[PDB]
Amino acid sequence: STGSATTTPIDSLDDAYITPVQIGTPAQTLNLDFDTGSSDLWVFSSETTASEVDGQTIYTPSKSTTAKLLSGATWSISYGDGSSSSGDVYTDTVSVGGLTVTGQAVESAKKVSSSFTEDSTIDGLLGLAFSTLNTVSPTQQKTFFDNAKASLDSPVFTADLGYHAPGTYNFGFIDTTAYTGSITYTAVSTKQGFWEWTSTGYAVGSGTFKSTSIDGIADTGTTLLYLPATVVSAYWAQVSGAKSSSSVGGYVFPCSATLPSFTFGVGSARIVIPGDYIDFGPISTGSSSCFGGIQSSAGIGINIFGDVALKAAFVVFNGATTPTLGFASK
């Protein structure tokens, strides 16, 4: 089997991407944030505290003939941005782009934090990291990808995120028309439950490439590119008027400045992030200070190749017995 679904930016900045997912019978279609940095499929639901729902589409398990309470199971998750959610669990039929999993754990939110309530466009998350991070207790549950894996033509999924445009998540096959050149594969460590890999270095604009190992995670659920402070400082030093603002919470730059590209290494290959991808617009409406798309990972505890980086590539998440990551230009 395979599946193929279009993923669409939630706003003009590509702050996140939503992908339609069919849950239950008859289908209830919710727009979920596919997140390769977490491992819970959770949804706004008929059980979510009413005051915490503001415009989202909800899953109503009582209207699904295939929903079954996963008795006794609860879940509770906190994300790197400080957001959180929790609730109980149903199993139900879940389909993504034509690919169907029966008995998928669908984690029904009883509570969500304010960041989720305030984002009307995201009806929940679909985790695509390793199932060892799944938060269901007492019985940890498998991700949609892990459940689908044995049925897939090939045990892979791919992320092809657009810059200010829709893209595609494919399951079970590699679309050879979707990238240029070759796919360079690189080793993954699953020790922390993430798609964790080691970039071979970076370049700023037309500068010389610096060979240096940068361990980080491929995370479709994080907007920006978070790298060590040394790397980030070297980037922003090439932008006229750029500075790190403690009041704003990162690097900002005058909207009049030109942004250089940023290149990251994948083995001997190179992925070039165009300068435009690093522009996240005014810090507040009408401001001449623009927020940067490359920020320091210091104090996160991990480097994160978020959407800014991933959308510059065609990315293969290879879930073979020994997982790997592939990157191609496109």
XYZ file of C-alpha atoms in Angstrom:
330
model
C 0.000 0.000 0.000
C 0.864 3.675 -0.290
C -0.605 7.015 0.664
C -0.142 10.557 -0.628
C -1.532 13.699 0.984
C -1.081 17.384 0.337
C 0.161 19.490 3.234
C -0.693 23.207 3.342
C 0.830 26.109 5.255
C -1.453 27.467 7.970
C -0.497 31.072 7.268
C 1.591 33.346 5.055
C 4.765 32.640 7.058
C 4.710 28.831 6.879
C 4.423 28.741 10.685
C 3.198 25.137 10.375
C 1.583 22.831 7.833
C -1.743 20.988 8.022
C -2.669 17.730 6.343
C -6.219 16.367 6.128
C -6.728 13.083 7.983
C -9.831 10.884 7.944
C -10.777 9.454 11.343
C -13.602 7.056 12.052
C -16.647 5.725 10.229
C -18.153 7.645 8.541
C -14.997 9.664 8.064
C -14.418 12.741 10.159
C -11.784 14.862 8.452
C -9.466 16.812 10.723
C -6.508 18.936 9.698
C -3.498 17.694 11.603
C 0.039 18.959 12.061
C 2.348 16.102 10.983
C 5.162 16.202 13.486
C 8.342 14.163 12.987
C 9.450 15.447 16.417
C 6.746 13.705 18.476
C 4.880 10.420 18.517
C 1.290 11.041 19.603
C -1.712 11.329 17.286
C -4.005 13.579 19.307
C -7.097 15.550 18.341
C -9.460 18.206 19.505
C -12.612 16.293 20.356
C -16.082 16.291 21.828
C -14.310 15.676 25.141
C -12.135 18.801 24.999
C -13.006 21.404 27.673
C -15.389 23.731 25.821
C -13.602 26.938 26.839
C -10.417 25.580 25.227
C -11.998 25.031 21.801
C -12.051 28.047 19.427
C -12.735 27.237 15.797
C -11.141 23.805 15.535
C -12.860 20.821 13.975
C -13.430 18.154 16.602
C -13.415 14.369 16.536
C -16.564 12.908 18.061
C -15.919 9.240 18.854
C -19.583 8.582 19.699
C -20.454 9.264 16.039
C -17.927 6.715 14.791
C -19.085 3.118 14.424
C -15.475 1.909 14.531
C -14.341 3.899 17.601
C -13.548 1.914 20.756
C -12.423 3.308 24.071
C -8.929 2.157 24.944
C -10.022 1.477 28.465
C -7.874 2.936 31.220
C -5.456 4.657 28.843
C -4.465 8.278 29.332
C -1.934 10.558 27.692
C -0.177 13.783 28.489
C 2.402 15.618 26.429
C 4.499 18.759 26.684
C 6.279 20.232 23.681
C 9.493 22.225 23.354
C 7.567 25.474 22.912
C 5.928 25.026 26.319
C 2.583 23.939 24.922
C 0.765 20.857 26.212
C -2.313 18.652 25.973
C -3.752 15.565 27.662
C -6.725 13.218 27.667
C -7.884 9.672 27.026
C -7.637 7.316 24.066
C -9.805 5.627 21.481
C -8.793 3.244 18.755
C -10.306 3.970 15.364
C -9.716 3.773 11.632
C -7.373 6.495 10.387
C -6.613 7.219 6.731
C -4.038 9.578 5.269
C -4.057 10.195 1.553
C -5.673 6.865 0.768
C -3.615 4.794 3.219
C -5.730 3.239 5.979
C -4.737 1.974 9.425
C -7.303 0.139 11.506
C -6.946 0.184 15.280
C -4.905 3.389 15.374
C -4.650 5.038 18.787
C -6.466 8.372 18.515
C -5.705 10.416 21.610
C -8.696 12.537 22.511
C -7.848 15.817 24.200
C -9.625 16.681 27.411
C -7.328 19.672 27.926
C -5.112 21.727 25.609
C -2.912 24.706 26.420
C -3.643 28.188 25.183
C -1.326 28.046 22.151
C -3.452 25.243 20.748
C -6.788 26.929 21.494
C -5.525 30.105 19.849
C -4.632 28.321 16.621
C -7.945 27.672 14.888
C -6.271 26.020 11.900
C -4.739 23.020 13.713
C -7.167 20.294 14.832
C -4.449 18.150 16.366
C -1.059 16.536 15.790
C 0.016 13.364 14.027
C 3.339 12.224 15.434
C 5.915 10.630 13.150
C 8.897 10.265 15.476
C 9.680 6.842 16.969
C 6.950 5.134 18.979
C 9.224 4.995 22.029
C 8.274 8.673 22.632
C 4.538 7.968 22.641
C 2.991 9.147 25.910
C 0.042 6.758 26.296
C -0.026 4.986 29.652
C -0.097 2.227 30.781
C 0.337 0.758 27.285
C 2.476 2.845 24.934
C 0.929 3.124 21.491
C 2.375 3.023 17.970
C 2.450 5.930 15.542
C 0.414 5.915 12.363
C 3.622 5.199 10.415
C 4.627 2.307 12.666
C 1.168 0.753 12.316
C 1.178 1.226 8.530
C 4.736 0.024 8.030
C 4.200 -3.656 7.371
C 1.552 -2.897 4.743
C 3.597 -0.260 2.934
C 5.330 -1.072 -0.336
C 8.498 0.317 1.266
C 8.892 1.220 4.970
C 9.336 4.945 4.352
C 7.586 8.251 4.315
C 8.692 11.452 2.669
C 8.265 15.130 3.502
C 8.233 17.622 0.645
C 7.283 20.900 2.298
C 6.599 23.982 0.230
C 7.925 27.496 0.611
C 4.832 29.668 0.894
C 3.039 26.866 -0.950
C 1.546 23.433 -0.429
C 3.649 20.303 -0.421
C 3.285 16.585 0.027
C 3.631 13.767 2.521
C 3.974 10.361 0.867
C 3.852 6.988 2.613
C 5.330 3.815 1.240
C 7.133 5.130 -1.838
C 9.696 7.624 -3.061
C 8.427 9.930 -5.833
C 11.444 10.172 -8.128
C 9.859 13.128 -9.968
C 9.785 15.226 -6.801
C 13.493 16.035 -6.487
C 16.560 16.848 -8.556
C 19.881 15.024 -8.461
C 20.326 12.127 -6.066
C 19.125 11.451 -2.510
C 21.980 11.379 -0.011
C 21.281 9.119 2.955
C 22.735 9.610 6.390
C 22.686 7.623 9.631
C 20.011 8.040 12.279
C 20.231 7.548 16.006
C 16.962 6.503 17.615
C 18.413 6.696 21.160
C 16.344 9.785 22.015
C 13.315 8.717 19.967
C 13.900 11.325 17.260
C 15.033 11.302 13.660
C 18.441 12.364 14.942
C 21.347 12.715 12.509
C 24.647 14.570 12.087
C 25.079 17.294 9.523
C 28.593 17.596 8.132
C 28.780 21.388 8.253
C 27.518 24.671 6.892
C 28.144 27.697 4.721
C 26.771 31.230 4.894
C 25.862 32.687 1.526
C 28.710 32.303 -0.937
C 31.176 31.678 1.885
C 33.438 28.681 2.215
C 31.943 25.543 3.671
C 32.885 24.836 7.273
C 33.300 21.135 7.949
C 31.941 20.476 11.426
C 29.630 17.858 12.911
C 26.222 19.188 13.925
C 23.954 16.673 15.644
C 20.277 17.522 15.318
C 16.752 16.298 14.639
C 14.646 16.450 11.510
C 11.474 17.996 12.913
C 8.549 18.935 10.659
C 6.728 20.179 13.762
C 9.204 22.979 14.457
C 8.966 26.128 12.343
C 12.538 27.393 12.431
C 16.120 26.165 12.150
C 17.828 26.032 15.570
C 21.586 25.607 15.517
C 24.521 26.207 17.861
C 25.135 29.821 18.828
C 28.479 29.865 16.999
C 26.853 28.912 13.683
C 23.938 31.281 14.150
C 26.190 34.204 15.046
C 28.259 33.558 11.915
C 25.085 33.691 9.801
C 23.629 36.894 11.252
C 26.991 38.661 11.175
C 26.510 38.705 7.388
C 23.222 40.601 7.633
C 23.388 44.371 7.876
C 21.781 45.580 11.094
C 20.984 42.133 12.486
C 21.082 41.634 16.239
C 19.965 39.255 18.926
C 17.156 40.810 20.926
C 16.462 39.414 24.371
C 13.170 41.346 24.448
C 11.971 39.740 21.225
C 13.511 36.346 21.930
C 16.026 35.912 19.130
C 17.730 37.405 16.110
C 15.947 40.189 14.273
C 16.997 42.143 11.224
C 15.888 45.204 9.288
C 13.372 44.356 6.739
C 15.504 46.451 4.318
C 18.408 43.973 4.527
C 19.121 41.145 2.105
C 19.414 37.683 3.621
C 22.169 35.328 2.491
C 21.412 31.685 1.849
C 22.411 29.042 4.373
C 23.889 25.727 3.297
C 23.948 22.599 5.424
C 25.872 19.410 4.777
C 24.424 15.944 4.374
C 27.411 13.676 3.997
C 29.271 15.056 1.007
C 26.062 16.632 -0.341
C 24.761 20.155 0.272
C 21.270 21.577 0.832
C 20.909 25.298 0.176
C 18.267 27.231 2.064
C 17.520 30.400 0.055
C 17.710 33.661 1.977
C 14.000 34.332 1.486
C 13.174 31.202 3.513
C 14.868 32.763 6.554
C 12.512 35.802 6.616
C 9.651 35.469 9.135
C 8.388 38.994 8.766
C 7.712 41.826 11.168
C 7.985 41.081 14.884
C 4.679 42.959 15.277
C 2.376 44.486 12.663
C 3.944 47.553 11.100
C 7.396 46.968 12.596
C 10.525 47.450 10.550
C 12.193 44.700 12.602
C 11.868 41.275 11.004
C 12.220 37.941 12.809
C 14.933 35.577 11.671
C 14.365 32.009 10.626
C 17.698 30.745 11.951
C 17.965 30.933 15.717
C 20.184 29.625 18.476
C 19.494 26.199 19.960
C 21.328 27.147 23.155
C 19.117 26.173 26.066
C 16.873 23.893 23.979
C 19.343 21.095 24.511
C 19.205 19.889 20.920
C 19.683 21.316 17.443
C 16.529 21.265 15.347
C 16.309 21.098 11.572
C 12.791 22.491 11.461
C 10.653 23.534 8.527
C 13.036 26.319 7.412
C 15.617 23.658 6.636
C 13.377 20.779 5.606
C 11.346 22.780 3.092
C 14.549 23.360 1.104
C 14.791 19.592 0.519
C 12.970 16.416 -0.407
C 13.366 14.379 2.780
C 13.131 10.602 3.146
C 12.334 9.197 6.547
C 13.468 5.609 6.091
C 11.941 3.362 8.748
C 13.750 0.213 7.713
C 15.177 -1.978 10.491
C 18.144 0.370 10.561
C 16.546 3.763 10.039
C 18.171 6.455 7.940
C 17.371 9.923 6.583
C 17.702 10.989 2.970
C 17.954 14.517 1.627
C 17.731 15.695 -1.967
C 17.590 19.132 -3.537
C 14.414 19.992 -5.403
